[PDB]
């Protein structure tokens, strides 16, 4: 997250860190959202590589013991069947991870609530992106979980020529684009939390930013629109 602030450690208890085994250690690669005690929602592109993955819930500082973490292996990966790694702009950038164990819920570990199917945010709706991704274009991962306020940019604007044009689809949500605050590498897969009727819900799964940089004016961060995938999510969970 470029232009973020440190999150309070109990603000975003559905946020997870998706990590891969790297030699004798683990490395953060993506975010995700805990949606059941044994299921995480992330981006498909985050699990393209043939790596050994784990999820960390209750994480705040990637580099220090928080005293709240639970570490769990990923047992099964279900990528959306229409995902094409050659074509992030086509959409379908969503995957579900079944965890090897069910995590225990507490103030640091909670299920993300998802929007009702079909919900579309009004332009300029209030949302926060969260994650441990790069804090500058071509920078380094955050240590501590970051948040940035990224109001939505509706489809009509986002898909206009000076924004993303044809690359953004109605199955996506755009947010930000002010040139200061954005998602960045390492935030992919994590949530966009939007305040609706008094309650934050996870409306987006971070999918992509510009190839020209993270915080680029009129290139808002692009998210998979969770409300387009409710039936898919429920079908996967019911059949696994
Ligand atoms: Na930690």
Curated annotation (Swiss-Prot):
Q: In the UniProt record, does the keyword Cytoplasm occur?
A: no
What family is this?
Belongs to the peptidase S1 family. Elastase subfamily.
Q: Which GO terms describe its biological process?
A: proteolysis
Disulfide bridge partners, by residue number: 30-46, 127-194, 158-174, 184-214
Task: Check the record and name the SUPFAM superfamilies matching this protein.
Answer: Trypsin-like serine proteases
Q: What is this protein called?
A: Chymotrypsin-like elastase family member 1
Tell me which UniProt keywords the record has, alphabetically: Calcium, Disulfide bond, Hydrolase, Metal-binding, Protease, Secreted, Serine protease, Signal, Zymogen
**Tissue/organ expression:** Pancreas. Basal layers of the epidermis, hair follicle and sebaceous gland epithelia (at protein level).
Residue ranges occupied by any Peptidase S1 domain in the UniProt entry: 1-238
Q: Where in the cell is it found?
A: Secreted
Q: Which residues form the active site?
A: 45, 93, 188
Q: GO CC annotations?
A: extracellular space
Give the enzyme's EC designation: 3.4.21.36
Cofactor note, please?
Binds 1 Ca(2+) ion per subunit.
Question: Origin organism of this chain?
Answer: Sus scrofa
Look up the domain of life of the source.
Eukaryota
* Cofactor requirements of the protein: Ca(2+)
Molecular-function GO term, any one:
metal ion binding
């Amino acid at each position: 997250v470029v232009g973020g602030t440190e999150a309070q450690r109990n603000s975003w208890p559905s946020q997870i860190s998706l990590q891969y085994r790297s030699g004798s250690s683990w490395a953060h690669t993506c975010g995700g959202t805990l949606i059941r005690q044994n299921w995480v929602m992330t981006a498909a592109h985050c699990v393209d590589r043939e790596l050994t993955f784990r999820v960390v819930v209750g994480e705040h500082n990637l580099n220090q013991n928080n005293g709240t973490e639970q570490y769990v292996g990923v047992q099964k990966i279900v990528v959306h069947p229409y995902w094409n790694t050659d074509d992030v702009a086509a959409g379908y950038d969503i995957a579900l991870l079944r965890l090897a164990q069910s995590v225990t819920l507490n103030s640091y570990v909670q299920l993300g609530v998802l929007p009702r199917a079909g919900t579309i945010l009004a332009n300029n709706s209030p949302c926060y992106i969260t994650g441990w991704g790069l804090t500058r274009t071509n920078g380094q991962l955050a240590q501590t979980l970051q948040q940035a306020y990224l109001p939505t940019v509706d489809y009509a604007i986002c898909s206009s020529s000076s924004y993303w044009g044809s690359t953004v689809k109605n199955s996506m949500v755009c947010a930000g684009g002010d040139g200061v605050r954005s998602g960045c590498q390492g935030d992919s897969g994590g949530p966009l939390h939007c305040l609706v009727n008094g309650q934050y819900a996870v409306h987006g799964v971070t999918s992509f930013v510009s190839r020209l940089g993270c915080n680029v004016t009129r290139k808002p961060t692009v998210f998979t629109r969770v409300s387009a995938y409710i039936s898919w999510i429920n079908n996967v969970i019911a059949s696994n």
